[PDB]
Structure formats: C-alpha cells, structure tokens
PDB file of C-alpha atoms and ligand atoms in Angstrom:
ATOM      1  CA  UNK A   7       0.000   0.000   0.000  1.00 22.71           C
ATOM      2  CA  UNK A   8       1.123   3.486  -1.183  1.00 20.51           C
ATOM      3  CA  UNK A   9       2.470   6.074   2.207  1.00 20.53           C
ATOM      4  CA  UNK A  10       0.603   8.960   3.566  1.00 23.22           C
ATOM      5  CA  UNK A  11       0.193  12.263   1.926  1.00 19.24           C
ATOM      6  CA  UNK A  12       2.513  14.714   3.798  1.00 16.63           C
ATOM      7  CA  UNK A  13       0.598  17.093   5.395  1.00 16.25           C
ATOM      8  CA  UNK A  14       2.069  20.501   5.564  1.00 13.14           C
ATOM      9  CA  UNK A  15       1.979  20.011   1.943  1.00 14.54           C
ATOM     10  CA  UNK A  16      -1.962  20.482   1.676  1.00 14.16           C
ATOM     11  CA  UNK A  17      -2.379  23.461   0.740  1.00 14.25           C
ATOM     12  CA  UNK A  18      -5.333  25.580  -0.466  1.00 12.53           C
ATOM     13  CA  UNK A  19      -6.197  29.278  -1.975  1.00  9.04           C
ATOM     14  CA  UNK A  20      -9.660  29.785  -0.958  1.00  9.27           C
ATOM     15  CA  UNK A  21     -12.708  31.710  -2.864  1.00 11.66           C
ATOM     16  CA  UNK A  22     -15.689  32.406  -1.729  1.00 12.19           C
ATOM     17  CA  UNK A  23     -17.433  28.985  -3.332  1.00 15.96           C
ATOM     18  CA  UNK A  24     -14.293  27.926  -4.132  1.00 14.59           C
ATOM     19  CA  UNK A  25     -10.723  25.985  -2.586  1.00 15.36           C
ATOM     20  CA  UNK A  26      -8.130  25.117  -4.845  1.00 17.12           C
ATOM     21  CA  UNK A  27      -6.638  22.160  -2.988  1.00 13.47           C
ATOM     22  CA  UNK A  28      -2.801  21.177  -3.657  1.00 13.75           C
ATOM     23  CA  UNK A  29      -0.589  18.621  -2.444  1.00 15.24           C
ATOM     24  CA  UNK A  30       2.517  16.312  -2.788  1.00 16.41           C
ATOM     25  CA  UNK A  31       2.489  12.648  -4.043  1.00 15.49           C
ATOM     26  CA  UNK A  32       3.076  10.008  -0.748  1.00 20.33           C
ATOM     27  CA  UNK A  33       6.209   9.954   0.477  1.00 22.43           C
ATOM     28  CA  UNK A  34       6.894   6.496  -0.208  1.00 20.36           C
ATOM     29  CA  UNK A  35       4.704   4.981  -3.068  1.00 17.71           C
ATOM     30  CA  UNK A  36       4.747   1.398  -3.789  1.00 17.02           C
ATOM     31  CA  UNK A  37       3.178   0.889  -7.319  1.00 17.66           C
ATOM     32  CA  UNK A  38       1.461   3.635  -8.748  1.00 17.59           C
ATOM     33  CA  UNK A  39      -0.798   5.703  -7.397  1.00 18.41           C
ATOM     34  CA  UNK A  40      -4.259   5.415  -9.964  1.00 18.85           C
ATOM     35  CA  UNK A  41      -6.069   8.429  -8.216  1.00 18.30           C
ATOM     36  CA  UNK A  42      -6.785  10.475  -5.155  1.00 13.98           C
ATOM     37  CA  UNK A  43      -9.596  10.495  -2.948  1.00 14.99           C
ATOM     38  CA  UNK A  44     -10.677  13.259  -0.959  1.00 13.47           C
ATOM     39  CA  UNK A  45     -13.174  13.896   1.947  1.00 15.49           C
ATOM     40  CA  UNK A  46     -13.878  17.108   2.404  1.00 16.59           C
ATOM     41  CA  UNK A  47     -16.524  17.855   5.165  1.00 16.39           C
ATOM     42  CA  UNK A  48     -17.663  21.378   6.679  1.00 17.09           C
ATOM     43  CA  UNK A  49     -15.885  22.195  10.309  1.00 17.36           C
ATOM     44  CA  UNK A  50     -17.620  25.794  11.304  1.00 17.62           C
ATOM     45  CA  UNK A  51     -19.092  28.712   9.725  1.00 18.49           C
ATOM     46  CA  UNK A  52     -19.373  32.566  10.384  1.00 21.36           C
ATOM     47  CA  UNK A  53     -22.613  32.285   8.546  1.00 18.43           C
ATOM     48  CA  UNK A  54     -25.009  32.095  11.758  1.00 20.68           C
ATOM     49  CA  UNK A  55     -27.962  30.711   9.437  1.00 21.61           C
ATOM     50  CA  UNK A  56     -26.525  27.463   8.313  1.00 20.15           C
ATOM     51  CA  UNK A  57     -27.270  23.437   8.085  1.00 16.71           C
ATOM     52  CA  UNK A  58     -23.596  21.872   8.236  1.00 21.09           C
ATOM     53  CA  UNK A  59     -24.600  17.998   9.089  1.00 24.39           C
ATOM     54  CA  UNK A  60     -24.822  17.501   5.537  1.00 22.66           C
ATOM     55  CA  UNK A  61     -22.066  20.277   3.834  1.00 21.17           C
ATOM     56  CA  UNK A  62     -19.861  17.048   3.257  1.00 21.45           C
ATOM     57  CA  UNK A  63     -18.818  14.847   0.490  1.00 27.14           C
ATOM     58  CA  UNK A  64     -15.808  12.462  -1.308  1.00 27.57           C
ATOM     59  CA  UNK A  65     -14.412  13.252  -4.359  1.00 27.72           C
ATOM     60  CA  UNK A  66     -12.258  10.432  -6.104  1.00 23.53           C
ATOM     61  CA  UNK A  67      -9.808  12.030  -8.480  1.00 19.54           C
ATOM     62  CA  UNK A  68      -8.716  10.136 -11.202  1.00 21.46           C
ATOM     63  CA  UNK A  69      -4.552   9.914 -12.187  1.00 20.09           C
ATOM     64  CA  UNK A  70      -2.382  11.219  -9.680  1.00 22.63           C
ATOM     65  CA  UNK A  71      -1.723  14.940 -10.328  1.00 18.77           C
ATOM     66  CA  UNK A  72      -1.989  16.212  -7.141  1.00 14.52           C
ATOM     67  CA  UNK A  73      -4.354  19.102  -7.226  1.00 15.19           C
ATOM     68  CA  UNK A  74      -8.365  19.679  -7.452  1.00 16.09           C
ATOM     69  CA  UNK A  75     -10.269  22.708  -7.553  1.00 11.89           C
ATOM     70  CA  UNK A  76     -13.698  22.737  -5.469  1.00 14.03           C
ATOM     71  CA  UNK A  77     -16.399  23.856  -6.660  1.00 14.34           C
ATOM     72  CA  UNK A  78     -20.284  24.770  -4.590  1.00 14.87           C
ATOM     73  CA  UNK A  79     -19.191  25.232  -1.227  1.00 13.35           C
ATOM     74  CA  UNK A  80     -20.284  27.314   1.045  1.00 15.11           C
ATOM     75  CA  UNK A  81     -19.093  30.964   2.127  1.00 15.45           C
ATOM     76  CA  UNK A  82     -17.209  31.792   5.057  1.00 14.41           C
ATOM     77  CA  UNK A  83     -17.183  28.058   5.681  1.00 13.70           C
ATOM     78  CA  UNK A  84     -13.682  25.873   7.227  1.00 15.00           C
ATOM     79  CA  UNK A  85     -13.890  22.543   5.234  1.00 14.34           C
ATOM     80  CA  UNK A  86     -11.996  19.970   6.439  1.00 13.79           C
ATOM     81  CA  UNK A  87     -10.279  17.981   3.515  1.00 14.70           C
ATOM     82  CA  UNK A  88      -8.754  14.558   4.190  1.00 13.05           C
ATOM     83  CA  UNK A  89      -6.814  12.556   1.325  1.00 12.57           C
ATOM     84  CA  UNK A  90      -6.055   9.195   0.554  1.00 13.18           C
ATOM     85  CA  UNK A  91      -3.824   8.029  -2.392  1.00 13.80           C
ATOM     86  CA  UNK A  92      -4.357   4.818  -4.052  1.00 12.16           C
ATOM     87  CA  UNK A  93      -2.200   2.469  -6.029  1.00 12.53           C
ATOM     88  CA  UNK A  94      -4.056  -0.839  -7.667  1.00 12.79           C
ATOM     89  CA  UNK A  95      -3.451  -2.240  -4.465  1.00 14.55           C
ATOM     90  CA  UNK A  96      -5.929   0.246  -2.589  1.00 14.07           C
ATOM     91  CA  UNK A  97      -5.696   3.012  -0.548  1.00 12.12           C
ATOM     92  CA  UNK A  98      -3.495   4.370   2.002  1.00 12.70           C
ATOM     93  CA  UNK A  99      -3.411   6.115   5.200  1.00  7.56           C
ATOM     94  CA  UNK A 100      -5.150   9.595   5.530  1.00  7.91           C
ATOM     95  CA  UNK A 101      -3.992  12.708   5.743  1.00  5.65           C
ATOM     96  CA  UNK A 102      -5.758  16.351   6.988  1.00  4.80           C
ATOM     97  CA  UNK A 103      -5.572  19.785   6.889  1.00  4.57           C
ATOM     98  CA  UNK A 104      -8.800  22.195   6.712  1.00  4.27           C
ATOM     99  CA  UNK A 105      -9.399  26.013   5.104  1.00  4.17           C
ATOM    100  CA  UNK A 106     -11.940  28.464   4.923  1.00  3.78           C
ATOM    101  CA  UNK A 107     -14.039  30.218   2.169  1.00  6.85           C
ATOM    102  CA  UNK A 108     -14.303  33.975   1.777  1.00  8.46           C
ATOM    103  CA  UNK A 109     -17.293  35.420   3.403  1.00  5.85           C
ATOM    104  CA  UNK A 110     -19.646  37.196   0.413  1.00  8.52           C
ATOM    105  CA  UNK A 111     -21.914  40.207   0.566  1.00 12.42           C
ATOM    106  CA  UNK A 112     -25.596  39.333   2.156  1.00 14.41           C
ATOM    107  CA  UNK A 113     -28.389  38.147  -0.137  1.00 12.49           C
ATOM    108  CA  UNK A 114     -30.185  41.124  -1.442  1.00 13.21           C
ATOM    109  CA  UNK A 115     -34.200  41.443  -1.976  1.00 16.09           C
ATOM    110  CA  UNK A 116     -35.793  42.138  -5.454  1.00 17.25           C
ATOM    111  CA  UNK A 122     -43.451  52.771  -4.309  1.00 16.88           C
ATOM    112  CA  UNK A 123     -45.700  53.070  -1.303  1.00 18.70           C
ATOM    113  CA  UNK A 124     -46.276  57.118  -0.931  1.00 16.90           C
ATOM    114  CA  UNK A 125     -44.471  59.339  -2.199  1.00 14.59           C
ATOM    115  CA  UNK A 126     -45.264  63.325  -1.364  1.00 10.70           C
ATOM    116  CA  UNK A 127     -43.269  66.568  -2.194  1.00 11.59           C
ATOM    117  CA  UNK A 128     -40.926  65.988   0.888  1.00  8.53           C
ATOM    118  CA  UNK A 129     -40.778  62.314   1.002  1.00  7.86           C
ATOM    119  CA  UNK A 130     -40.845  58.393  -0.554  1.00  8.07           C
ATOM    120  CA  UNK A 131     -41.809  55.109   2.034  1.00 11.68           C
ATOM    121  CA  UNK A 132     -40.822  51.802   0.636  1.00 12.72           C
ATOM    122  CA  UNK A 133     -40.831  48.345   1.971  1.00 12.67           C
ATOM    123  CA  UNK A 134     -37.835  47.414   3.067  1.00 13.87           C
ATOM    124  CA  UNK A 135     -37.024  43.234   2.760  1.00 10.34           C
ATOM    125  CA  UNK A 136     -34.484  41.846   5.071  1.00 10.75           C
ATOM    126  CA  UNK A 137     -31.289  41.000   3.362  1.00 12.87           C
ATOM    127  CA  UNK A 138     -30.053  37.578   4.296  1.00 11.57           C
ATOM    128  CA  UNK A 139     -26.392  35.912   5.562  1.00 12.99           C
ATOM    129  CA  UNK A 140     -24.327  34.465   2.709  1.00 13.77           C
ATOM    130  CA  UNK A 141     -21.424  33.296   4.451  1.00 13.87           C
ATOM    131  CA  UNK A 142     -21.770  36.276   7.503  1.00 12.80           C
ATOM    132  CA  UNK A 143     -24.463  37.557   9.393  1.00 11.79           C
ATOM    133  CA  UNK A 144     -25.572  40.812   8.155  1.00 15.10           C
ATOM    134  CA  UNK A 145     -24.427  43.726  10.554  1.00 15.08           C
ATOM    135  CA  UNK A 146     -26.139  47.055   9.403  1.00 17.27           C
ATOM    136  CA  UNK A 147     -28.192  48.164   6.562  1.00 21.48           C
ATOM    137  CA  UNK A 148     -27.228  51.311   5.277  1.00 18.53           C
ATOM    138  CA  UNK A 149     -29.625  53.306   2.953  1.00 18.75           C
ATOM    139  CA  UNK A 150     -28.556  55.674   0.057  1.00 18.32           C
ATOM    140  CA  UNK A 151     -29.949  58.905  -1.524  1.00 16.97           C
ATOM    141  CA  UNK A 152     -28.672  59.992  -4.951  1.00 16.16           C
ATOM    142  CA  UNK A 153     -29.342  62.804  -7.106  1.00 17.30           C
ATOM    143  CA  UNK A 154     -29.414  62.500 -10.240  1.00 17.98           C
ATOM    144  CA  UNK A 168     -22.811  49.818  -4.412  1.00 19.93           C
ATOM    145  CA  UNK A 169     -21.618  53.060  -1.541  1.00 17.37           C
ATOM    146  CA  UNK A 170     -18.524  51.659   0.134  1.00 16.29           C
ATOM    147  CA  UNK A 171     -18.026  55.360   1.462  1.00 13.86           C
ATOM    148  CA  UNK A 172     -20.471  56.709   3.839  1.00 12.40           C
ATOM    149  CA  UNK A 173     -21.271  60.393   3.860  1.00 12.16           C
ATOM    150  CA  UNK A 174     -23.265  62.174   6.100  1.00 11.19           C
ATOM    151  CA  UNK A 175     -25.540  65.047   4.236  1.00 11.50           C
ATOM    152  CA  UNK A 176     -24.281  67.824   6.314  1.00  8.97           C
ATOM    153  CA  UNK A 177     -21.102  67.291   4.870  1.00  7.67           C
ATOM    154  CA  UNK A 178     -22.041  65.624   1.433  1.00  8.39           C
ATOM    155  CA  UNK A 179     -22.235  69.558  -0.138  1.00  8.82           C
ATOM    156  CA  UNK A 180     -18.515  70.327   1.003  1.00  9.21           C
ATOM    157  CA  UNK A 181     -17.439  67.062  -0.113  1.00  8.67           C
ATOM    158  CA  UNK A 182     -19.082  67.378  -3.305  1.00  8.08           C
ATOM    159  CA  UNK A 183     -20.966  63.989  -3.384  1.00  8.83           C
ATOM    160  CA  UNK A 184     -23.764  62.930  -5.344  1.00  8.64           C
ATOM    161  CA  UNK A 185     -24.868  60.817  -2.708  1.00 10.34           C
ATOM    162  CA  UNK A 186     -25.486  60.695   0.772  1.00  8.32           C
ATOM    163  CA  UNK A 187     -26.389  58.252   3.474  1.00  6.87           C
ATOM    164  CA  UNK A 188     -29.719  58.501   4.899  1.00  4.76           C
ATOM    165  CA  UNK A 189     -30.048  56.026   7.704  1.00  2.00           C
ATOM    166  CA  UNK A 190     -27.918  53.180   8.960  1.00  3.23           C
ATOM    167  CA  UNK A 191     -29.531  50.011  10.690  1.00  2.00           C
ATOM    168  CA  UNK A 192     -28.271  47.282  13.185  1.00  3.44           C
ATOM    169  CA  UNK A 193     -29.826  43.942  11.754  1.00  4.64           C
ATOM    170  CA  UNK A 194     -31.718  43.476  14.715  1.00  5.35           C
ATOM    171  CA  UNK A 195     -33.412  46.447  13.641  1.00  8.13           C
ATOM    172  CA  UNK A 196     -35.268  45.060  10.178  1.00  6.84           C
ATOM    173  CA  UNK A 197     -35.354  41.004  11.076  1.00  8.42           C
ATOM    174  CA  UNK A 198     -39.066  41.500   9.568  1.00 10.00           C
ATOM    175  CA  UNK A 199     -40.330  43.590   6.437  1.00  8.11           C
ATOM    176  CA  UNK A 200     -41.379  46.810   7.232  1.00  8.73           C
ATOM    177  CA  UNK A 201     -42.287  50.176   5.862  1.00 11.25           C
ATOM    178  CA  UNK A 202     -39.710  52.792   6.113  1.00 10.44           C
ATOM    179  CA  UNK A 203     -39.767  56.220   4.884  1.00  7.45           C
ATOM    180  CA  UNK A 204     -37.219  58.628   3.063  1.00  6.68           C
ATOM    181  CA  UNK A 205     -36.990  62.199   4.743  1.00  2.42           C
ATOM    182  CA  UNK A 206     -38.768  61.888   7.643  1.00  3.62           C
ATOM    183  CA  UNK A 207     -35.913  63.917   9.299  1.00  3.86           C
ATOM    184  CA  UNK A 208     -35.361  61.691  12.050  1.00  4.66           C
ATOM    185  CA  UNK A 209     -31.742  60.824  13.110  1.00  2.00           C
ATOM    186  CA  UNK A 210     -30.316  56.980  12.387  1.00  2.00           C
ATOM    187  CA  UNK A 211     -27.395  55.742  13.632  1.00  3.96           C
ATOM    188  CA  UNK A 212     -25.931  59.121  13.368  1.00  3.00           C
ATOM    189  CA  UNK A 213     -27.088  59.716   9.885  1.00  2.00           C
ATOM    190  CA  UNK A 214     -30.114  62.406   9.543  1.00  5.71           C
ATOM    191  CA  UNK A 215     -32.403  61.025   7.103  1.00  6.28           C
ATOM    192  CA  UNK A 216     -32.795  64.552   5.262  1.00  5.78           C
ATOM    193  CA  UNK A 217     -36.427  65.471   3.950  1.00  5.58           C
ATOM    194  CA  UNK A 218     -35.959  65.282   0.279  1.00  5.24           C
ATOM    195  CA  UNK A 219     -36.136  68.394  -2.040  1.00  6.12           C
ATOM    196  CA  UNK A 220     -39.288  68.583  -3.889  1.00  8.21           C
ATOM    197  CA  UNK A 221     -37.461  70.124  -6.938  1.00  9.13           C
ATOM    198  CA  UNK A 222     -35.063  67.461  -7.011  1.00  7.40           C
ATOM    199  CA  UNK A 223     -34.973  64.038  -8.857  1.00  9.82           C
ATOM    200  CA  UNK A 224     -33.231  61.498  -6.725  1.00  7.28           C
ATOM    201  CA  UNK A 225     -32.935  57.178  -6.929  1.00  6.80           C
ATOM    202  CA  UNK A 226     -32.804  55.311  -3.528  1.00  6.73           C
ATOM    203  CA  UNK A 227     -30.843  52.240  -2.981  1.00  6.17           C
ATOM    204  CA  UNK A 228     -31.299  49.594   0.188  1.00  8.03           C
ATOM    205  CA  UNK A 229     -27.724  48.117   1.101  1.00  7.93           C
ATOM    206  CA  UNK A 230     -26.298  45.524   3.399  1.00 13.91           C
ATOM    207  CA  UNK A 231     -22.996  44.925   4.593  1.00 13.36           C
ATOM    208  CA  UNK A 232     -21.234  41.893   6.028  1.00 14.45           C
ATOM    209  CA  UNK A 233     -18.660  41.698   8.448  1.00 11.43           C
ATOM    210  CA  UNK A 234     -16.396  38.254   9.552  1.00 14.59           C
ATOM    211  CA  UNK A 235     -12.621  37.976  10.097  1.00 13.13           C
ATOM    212  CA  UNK A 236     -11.773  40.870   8.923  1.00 11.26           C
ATOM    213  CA  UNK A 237     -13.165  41.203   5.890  1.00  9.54           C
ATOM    214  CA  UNK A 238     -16.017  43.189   4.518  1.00 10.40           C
ATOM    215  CA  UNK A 239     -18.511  42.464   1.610  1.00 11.24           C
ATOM    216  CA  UNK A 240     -21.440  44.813   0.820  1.00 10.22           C
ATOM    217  CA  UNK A 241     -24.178  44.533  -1.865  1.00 11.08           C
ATOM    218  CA  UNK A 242     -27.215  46.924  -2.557  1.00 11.67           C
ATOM    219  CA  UNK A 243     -30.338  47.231  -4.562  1.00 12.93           C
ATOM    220  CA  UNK A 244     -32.337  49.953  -5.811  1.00 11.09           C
ATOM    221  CA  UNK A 245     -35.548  50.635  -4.389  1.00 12.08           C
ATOM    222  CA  UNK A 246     -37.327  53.796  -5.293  1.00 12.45           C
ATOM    223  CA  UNK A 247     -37.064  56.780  -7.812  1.00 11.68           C
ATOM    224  CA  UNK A 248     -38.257  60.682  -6.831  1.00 10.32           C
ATOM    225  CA  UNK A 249     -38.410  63.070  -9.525  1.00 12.82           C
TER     226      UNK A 249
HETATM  227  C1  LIG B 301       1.819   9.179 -12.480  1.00 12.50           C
HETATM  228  O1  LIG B 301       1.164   9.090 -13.767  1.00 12.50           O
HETATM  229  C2  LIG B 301       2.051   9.154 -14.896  1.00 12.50           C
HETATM  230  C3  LIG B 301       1.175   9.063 -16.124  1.00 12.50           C
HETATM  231  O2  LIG B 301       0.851   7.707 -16.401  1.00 12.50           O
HETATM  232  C4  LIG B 301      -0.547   7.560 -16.722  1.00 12.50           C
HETATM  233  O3  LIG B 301      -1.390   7.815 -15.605  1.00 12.50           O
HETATM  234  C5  LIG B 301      -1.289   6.892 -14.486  1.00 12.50           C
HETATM  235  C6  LIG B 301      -2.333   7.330 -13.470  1.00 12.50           C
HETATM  236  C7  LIG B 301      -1.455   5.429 -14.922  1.00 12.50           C
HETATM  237  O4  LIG B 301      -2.798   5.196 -15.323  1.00 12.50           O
HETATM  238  C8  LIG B 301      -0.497   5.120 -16.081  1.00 12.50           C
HETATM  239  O5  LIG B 301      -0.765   3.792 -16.528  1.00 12.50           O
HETATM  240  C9  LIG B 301      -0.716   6.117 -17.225  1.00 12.50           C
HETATM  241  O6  LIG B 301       0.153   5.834 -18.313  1.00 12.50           O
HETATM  242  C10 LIG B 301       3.068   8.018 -14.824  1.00 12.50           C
HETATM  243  O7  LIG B 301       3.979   8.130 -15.913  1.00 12.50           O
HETATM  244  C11 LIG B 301       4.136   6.839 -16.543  1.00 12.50           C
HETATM  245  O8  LIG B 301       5.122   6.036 -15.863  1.00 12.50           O
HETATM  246  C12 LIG B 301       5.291   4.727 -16.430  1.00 12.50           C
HETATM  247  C13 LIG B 301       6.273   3.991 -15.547  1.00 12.50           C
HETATM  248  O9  LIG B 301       7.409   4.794 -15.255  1.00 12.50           O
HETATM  249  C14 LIG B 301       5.757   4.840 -17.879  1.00 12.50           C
HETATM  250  O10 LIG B 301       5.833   3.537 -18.449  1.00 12.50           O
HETATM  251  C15 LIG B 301       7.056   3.335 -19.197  1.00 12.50           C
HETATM  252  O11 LIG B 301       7.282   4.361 -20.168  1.00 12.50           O
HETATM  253  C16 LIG B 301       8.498   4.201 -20.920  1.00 12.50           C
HETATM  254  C17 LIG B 301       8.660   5.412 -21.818  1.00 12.50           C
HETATM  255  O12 LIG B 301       8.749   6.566 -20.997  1.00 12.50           O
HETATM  256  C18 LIG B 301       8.412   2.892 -21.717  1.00 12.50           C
HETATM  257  O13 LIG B 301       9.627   2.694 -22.425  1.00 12.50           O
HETATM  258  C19 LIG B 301       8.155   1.703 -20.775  1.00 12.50           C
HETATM  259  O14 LIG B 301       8.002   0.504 -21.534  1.00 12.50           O
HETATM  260  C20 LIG B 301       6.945   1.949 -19.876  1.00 12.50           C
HETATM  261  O15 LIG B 301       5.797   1.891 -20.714  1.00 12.50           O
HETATM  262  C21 LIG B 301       4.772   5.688 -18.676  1.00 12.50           C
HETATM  263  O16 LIG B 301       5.263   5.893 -19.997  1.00 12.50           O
HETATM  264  C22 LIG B 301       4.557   7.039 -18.001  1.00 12.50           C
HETATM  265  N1  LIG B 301       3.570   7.820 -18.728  1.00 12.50           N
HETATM  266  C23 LIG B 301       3.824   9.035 -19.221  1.00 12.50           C
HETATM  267  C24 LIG B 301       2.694   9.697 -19.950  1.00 12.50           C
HETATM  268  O17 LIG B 301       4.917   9.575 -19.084  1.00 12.50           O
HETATM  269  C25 LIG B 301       3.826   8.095 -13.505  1.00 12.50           C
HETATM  270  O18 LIG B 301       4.745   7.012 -13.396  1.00 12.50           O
HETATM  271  C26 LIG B 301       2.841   8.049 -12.343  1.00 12.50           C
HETATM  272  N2  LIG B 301       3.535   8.108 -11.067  1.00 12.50           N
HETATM  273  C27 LIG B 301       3.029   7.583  -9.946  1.00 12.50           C
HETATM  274  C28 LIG B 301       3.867   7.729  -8.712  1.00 12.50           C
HETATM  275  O19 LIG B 301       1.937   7.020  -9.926  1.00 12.50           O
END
C-alpha cells in the first residue's frame, strides 16, 4: 500500500465557493498511485444561518496529479479535507488539513407614498451568505456606496450621494415600511427630507462583516423626480 500524503503540503487558496486544494504525491509509493480520494466535510461557519450535518462529500480524483479545484461550497465556511492516495493495491493512510471560504456580501431582496418631501418603501431583510448581516445602510442619490457620507457634509465634499439612515440587523429582522426624509436621526445619519425640486434614486444596502473582511451589496428601491 502506497504512504501517507505529507501534510504541511496540503495546501489551499480559498474563494468564496471555491478551494483550490494542492498537495505532494506520498512519500513512499509502492506501485502507482491510480487516483486520489478526498473527503472534504464542513468544520464551522461565520454564517449564523446554516445546516452543516450535511455540507460534506468524497471526491475520487482520477490519475495522480496532485491538485483539485472545489467547486459549490459554502461561504465563510472551514472545510476539512482529508486525502487518501491509491495504487491498484488500494488506498493508504489519511492525511488532513482544513481552510476556509471567503465570506460574500448578504443576499439582497428584489413605491408606497411618495409626497413633495418624502418616498416610504418596503424594506425586505437581506439575508447571511457566508456572515451575518451587521447594518443596513440606505442611500440617496441625485441625479454599491462603500463610502459613507453624512448630508451635512455631502455639499462640502461634493458627493452625489449621501447616506440617509444606517440600521443594526436586529433592527429590520421582519419587512417593514420605512420612509425617506422623515428627518429623524439613524445611527448618526439624519435622514434629510428630500427636495421637492429634485430628482433622486434610492438604494437599500447591506454589509457583512467576519474575520476581517467586509462584503457589501445593494439594490435599488425607489425613484423621486
Ligand atoms: C503518475 O502518472 C504518470 C502518467 O501515467 C498515466 O497515468 C497513471 C495514473 C497510470 O494510469 C499510467 O498507466 C498512465 O500511463 C506516470 O507516468 C508513466 O510512468 C510509467 C512507468 O514509469 C511509464 O511507463 C514506461 O514508459 C516508458 C517510456 O517513458 C516505456 O519505455 C516503458 O516501456 C513503460 O511503458 C509511462 O510511460 C509514463 N507515462 C507518461 C505519460 O509519461 C507516472 O509514473 C505516475 N507516477 C506515480 C507515482 O503514480
């Protein structure tokens, strides 16, 4: 029977649905090895909305280059990967070694009055794609926003846009009505009545934050000529 897979030499470059897992041949192979099979089988997740007893699998890779690329996993996810080579004899011992996936931006959703001063919209909740979602941040434009700006300071700054109101997730865990311009203060950002000679679009926007990183998405919800 062929050796173990060394394994320090497991390596991977993660994606966000994606590990490209690499390796070295067995240090000791008697015959040749015919293919590799790999277990791969989900560890943890940042995601907090997530089903991981069955986010598992075995892949049996054919020759013995000593690489394969993962495809439909999950974001934000540590996979544990566990090899086996195999000569015509069978298999060998195991070997281990476990990454992570990128954490992506939150799943985004798809006019209720609209006055002189003002638009209301229903806001959906966004939902966790590899991260809870931490705030929802909402956008006026005239005519996604990595950048916040506050509108006392978006005429200075010379900014097109400006953020209205900023939400905790907590805040928005079922739809609800909200309302652009009805001057009251969010998070620190003052949700500025609208001008009525003004044409502005509105966008709804979630972010995601996990070790480290941070993914935001955003759809638009509303226009106000
Ligand atoms: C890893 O795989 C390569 C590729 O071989 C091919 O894939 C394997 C998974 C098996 O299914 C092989 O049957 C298949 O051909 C192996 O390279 C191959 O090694 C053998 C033995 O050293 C070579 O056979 C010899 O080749 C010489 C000419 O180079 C002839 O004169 C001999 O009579 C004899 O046929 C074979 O040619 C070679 N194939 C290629 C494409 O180079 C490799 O050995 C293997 N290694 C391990 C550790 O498994």
């Amino acid at each position: 029977l062929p050796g173990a897979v060394p394994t320090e030499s497991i390596q991977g470059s993660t994606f966000e649905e994606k590990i490209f897992l690499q390796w070295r041949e067995p240090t000791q192979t008697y015959g040749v090895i015919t293919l590799y099979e790999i277990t791969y089988k989900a560890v943890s997740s940042f995601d907090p909305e997530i089903d991981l007893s069955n986010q598992s699998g075995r892949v049996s890779k054919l020759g013995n280059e000593t690489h394969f690329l993962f495809f439909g996993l999950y974001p934000g996810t540590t996979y544990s990967f566990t090899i086996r080579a195999s000569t015509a004899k069978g298999f060998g011992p195991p070997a281990t070694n476990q990454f992570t996936t990128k954490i992506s931006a939150p799943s985004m959703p798809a006019p209720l009055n609209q006055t002189d001063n003002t638009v209301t919209v229903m806001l959906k909740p966004a939902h966790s794609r590899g991260a809870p979602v931490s705030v929802y941040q909402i956008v006026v434009e005239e005519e996604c926003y990595p950048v916040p700006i506050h509108f006392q300071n978006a005429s200075l700054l010379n900014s097109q846009y400006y953020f209205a109101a900023e939400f905790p997730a907590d805040s928005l865990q079922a739809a609800q009505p909200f309302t652009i311009g009805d001057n009251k203060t969010y998070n620190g950002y003052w949700n500025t009545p609208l001008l009525p000679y003004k044409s502005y679009r509105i966008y709804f926007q979630a972010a995601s934050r996990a070790n480290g990183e941070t993914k935001i998405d955003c759809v638009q919800v509303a226009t106000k000529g």
